[PDB]
């Protein structure tokens, strides 16, 4: 509506009720709406980080976001007791438990990775569930497995804190470009999990890519990483009766279908529609047989253990346990014909689950909570980055360097406030470390926090007075070395121009850092940084003459989708006023098959370092078909 007089600030004062995703953004009143909406987009585009940290400057709603976003953690919902543990793989296993109140029998599943979509996934901290053994009670709110986002006390982190300085690094930090320390890039690490299906029919066999002559292994094992980005390759045969192609195991050909991924496979699920005796005779199936047997061994194992509970009259089983039991029973049961896409399939279909630690690489996009964007232009050694010299903070190196030009134009001032607060906090930490008793340290801490956030100061006084002297010393050391928590609420409770002004006036010793080779003094302060989903790999295309969807089906390493030339492109090329060469490129590259063959042949038969191509003048195949059909139509072109 036009009327905004209805909005009265006194009504919404002290409440963040009007904020949603921006509850994760400090000093949101100071950031523009455009930057805020970009931040909201980035949070969904954010990728999981192995070494995620709770933000140094926090809004205090982050833990709630971790709590109510259930995809990252598994919490027991009742008191349980561990009946038994069954293993399918070293990495994948199931735990059967009984409700201590209902008596219902339920199960919990353990796996290394969680697959979300495409390549996106994350590894699990499975410490607690792995600790559990038979006849061990699971308390009501225990967390069996957690994501890397959550910590020991279930604090939530979507990014890492990196020391940042606004500096013009050899023009590498141009526009939204960033230079990162190699150690810092190690901190910003993601996982990639892929579920890849290879379908081998009766006439297809898998080449011995991972095996010797004595032992035939055509695909990686559960504990082995993929080599050369090839899981397996299938050769289709016209008739598998001869079995003469035993000698062909090592070689590869273009006709063979190759399946591409990199990482450690962690689970194999095989769906077989072939009788066991038919499979056993051939040695080339040996590896497959093992996993098939293993699956059956797992399934049978659950069936024997749970048959009394499920098929007993009481049937105090959860629906999950019932369906798991039924599926395993179907697997062991004969006359089980597996159908994929509503059709019965020959041979077997294998699903590999592959987990890879994907590191930060050039072209990756990283951001802060304030809508800024950055692309990693260069990763440089720690020594090459700005390092302050001849101070109490001597040898401190900046993890990331950001563009100073245009910072105010972005209309997201809050990133600077985060930097200033962590930088001033460094001085407070050194002041605590340098001198005093524990009481002096808490006094300095409480004064600084009183300057920043009164609520944090009050709660910290309570928390500190609660602590024992040993615990107090440990907490103080944690603050000195790891960092200091500072609370900057989104709208109500953040500091401003006047408060930072007072902070700078009181702390006269705090002044810019003098770096080693830099004339201009610099400020180095920690900023919270997040890793975005975009990487160059998504849009890479490269094509050489002989969508296909093979790449989506993992049959091609990279997309070979052709680029399109149109009338606009032809006009811009026609600027040269040499139309014949443009037509030659079009015919040699696309339209004319004869000229295309000539180009390929000449490129491979001519001198490597001197290439001159002569193309024959011939009507294209499309033109020939057009003339033939038109003459049948009864109309003929007169070169009008």
């Amino acid at each position: 509506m036009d009327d905004i007089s209805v909005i009265k600030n006194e009504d919404y004062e002290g409440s963040h009720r009007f904020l949603a995703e921006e509850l994760l953004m400090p000093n949101a009143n100071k950031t523009d709406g455009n930057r805020s909406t970009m931040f909201c987009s980035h949070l969904a585009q954010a990728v999981t980080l192995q070494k995620a940290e709770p933000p140094l400057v926090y809004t205090n709603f982050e833990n709630q976001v971790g709590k109510y976003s259930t995809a990252g953690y598994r919490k027991a919902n009742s008191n349980y007791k561990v009946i038994e543990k069954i293993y399918k793989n070293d990495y994948n296993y199931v735990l059967i438990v009984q409700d201590q109140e209902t008596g219902e029998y339920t199960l919990f599943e353990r796996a290394e990775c969680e697959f979300l979509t495409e390549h996106y996934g994350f590894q699990w901290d499975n410490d607690k569930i792995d600790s559990l053994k038979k006849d061990d009670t699971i308390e009501k709110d225990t967390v069996l497995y957690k994501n890397t986002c959550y910590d020991e006390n279930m604090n939530f982190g979507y990014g890492v804190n990196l020391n940042a300085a606004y500096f013009s690094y050899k023009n590498e930090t141009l526009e939204d470009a960033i230079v990162i320390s190699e150690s810092a890039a190690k901190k910003l690490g993601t996982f990639s999990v892929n579920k890849v299906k290879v379908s081998v029919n009766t006439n297809d066999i898998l080449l011995n890519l991972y095996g010797d002559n004595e032992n035939y292994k055509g695909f990686p094992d559960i504990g082995e990483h993929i080599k050369n980005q090839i899981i397996a390759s299938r050769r289709r045969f016209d008739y598998n009766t001869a079995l003469y192609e035993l000698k062909n195991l090592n070689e590869m050909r273009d006709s063979d279908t190759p399946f591409f991924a990199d990482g450690k496979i962690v689970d194999i699920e095989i769906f077989s529609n072939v009788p066991e005796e038919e499979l056993k005779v051939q040695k080339y199936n040996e590896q497959v047989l093992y996993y098939i047997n293993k699956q059956k061994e797992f399934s049978n194992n659950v069936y024997q253990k749970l048959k009394k509970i499920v098929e007993g009259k009481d049937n105090n089983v959860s629906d999950k346990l019932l369906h798991f039991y039924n599926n395993c029973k179907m697997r062991i049961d004969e006359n089980i014909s597996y159908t994929y896409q509503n059709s019965k399939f020959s041979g077997f279909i294998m699903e590999f689950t592959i987990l890879e630690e994907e590191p930060l690489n050039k072209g990756s996009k990283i951001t802060g909570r304030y809508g800024n964007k950055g692309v990693i232009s260069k990763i440089l050694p720690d020594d090459q980055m700005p390092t302050v010299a001849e101070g109490r903070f001597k040898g401190l190196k900046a993890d990331i360097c950001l563009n100073p030009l245009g910072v105010f134009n972005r209309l997201n001032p809050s990133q600077l406030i985060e930097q200033e607060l962590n930088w001033i906090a460094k001085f407070i930490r050194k002041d605590m470390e340098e001198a005093g008793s524990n009481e002096e340290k808490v006094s300095i801490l409480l004064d600084f926090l009183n300057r920043v956030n009164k609520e944090e100061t009050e709660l910290m006084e309570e928390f500190i007075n609660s602590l024992n002297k040993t615990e107090l010393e440990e907490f103080l050391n944690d603050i000195i070395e790891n960092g200091i928590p500072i609370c900057q609420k989104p709208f109500f409770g953040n500091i401003g121009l006047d408060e930072l002004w007072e902070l700078y006036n009181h702390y006269d010793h705090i002044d810019y850092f003098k770096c080693e080779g830099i004339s201009t003094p610099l400020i180095i302060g920690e900023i919270y940084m997040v890793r975005l989903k975009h990487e160059p790999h998504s849009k890479f295309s490269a094509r050489s003459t002989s969508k296909s969807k093979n790449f989506k089906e993992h049959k091609d390493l990279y997309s070979k989708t052709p680029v399109r030339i149109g009338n606009m492109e032809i006009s811009n090329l026609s600027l040269t006023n040499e139309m014949g060469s443009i037509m030659d490129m079009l015919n040699s590259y696309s339209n004319n098959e004869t000229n295309r063959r000539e180009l390929i042949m000449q490129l491979l038969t001519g001198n490597p370092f001197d290439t001159n191509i002569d193309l024959s003048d011939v009507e294209s195949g499309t033109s020939k078909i057009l003339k033939s059909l038109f003459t049948c139509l009864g109309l003929s072109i007169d070169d009008v």
Binding site: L19, A20, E21, A44, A71
Partner: protein, 87 residues
């Protein structure tokens, strides 16, 4: 229904509290040029997210406020009563 295209464990706003004006029976349409519907309204404060939307289809989808209180006995209506009192 919507596929889980999530790249994150963070689900509170991407999926749990997400709303869409677009639907099978939708007053909202691209051809209808519902530019007003894509915009914000003062009632949105405290109930809907002002800055949460998708650049591809702005205003079609957004995030519900974590603190939103839907009145009990109003069948998931934002207010117990409509705009005009009629009394």
């Amino acid at each position: 229904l919507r596929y889980d295209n999530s790249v994150n464990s963070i689900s509170l706003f991407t999926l749990i509290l997400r709303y869409t004006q677009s639907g099978p029976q939708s007053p909202f349409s691209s051809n209808s040029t519902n530019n007003k519907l894509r915009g914000l309204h003062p009632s949105y404060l405290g109930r809907l997210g002002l800055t949460s939307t998708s650049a591809g289809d702005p205003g079609a989808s957004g995030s519900l406020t974590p603190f939103l209180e839907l009145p009990e006995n109003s069948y998931m209506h934002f207010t117990e009563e409509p705009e005009i009192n009629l009394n």
